[PDB]
Subunit: 58 residues, 4 copies
């Protein structure tokens, strides 16, 4: 039901930047569809974001 899948390259749409691959997912009441994204610039660094904060890029 997934907007993204593992390995998709995405970026944060606005505010503080973040860009890299989907490496996981999470689900809470506040964020029913969330993803973990490993930075392509800082290997090993991972942030989690709601789907609405991210967009897929080539």
């Amino acid at each position: 039901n997934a907007t993204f899948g593992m390995g998709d390259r995405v970026r944060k749409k606005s505010g503080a930047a973040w860009q890299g691959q989907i490496v996981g997912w999470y689900c809470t009441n506040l964020t029913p569809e969330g993803y973990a994204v490993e930075s392509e610039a800082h290997p090993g660094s991972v942030h989690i974001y709601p789907v609405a904060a991210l967009e897929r890029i080539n």
Copy 2:
């Protein structure tokens, strides 16, 4: 292959504290088995950790 599953209550074993439910998972080369945990004290706040940093509690 999962050490934990969704909804398990866990806590960080040492250093900065964290405690609440598993709400997701992630996988990188640095952390091949990682989990997202929603704080039971601060609803909506989620941290991600490697499995070795966490332990299941009742």
Copy 3:
């Protein structure tokens, strides 16, 4: 010029929760007045937020 000072007890006003003492500060173009807050529930755990996200409590 500080809205808060070290040791003030504050909480996040909305969205994911966070509550505890001011333990530091930071400044970027996106967040020209930001604070570090140590959770009173999870000792050692610290989040940083823009001033507009926080409010002082007793």
Copy 4:
């Protein structure tokens, strides 16, 4: 008493990567000397770390 000052360029020494400018500081019992660092790769993104995790670079 500061190891680093505002604007110093630093990087994380090991594990997950992080690199950019010092933009703040914090102090807790677990981390009596900590810094906020804004990523030079992801503008607006800031992480906090203990001094021992960081090193100054040119």
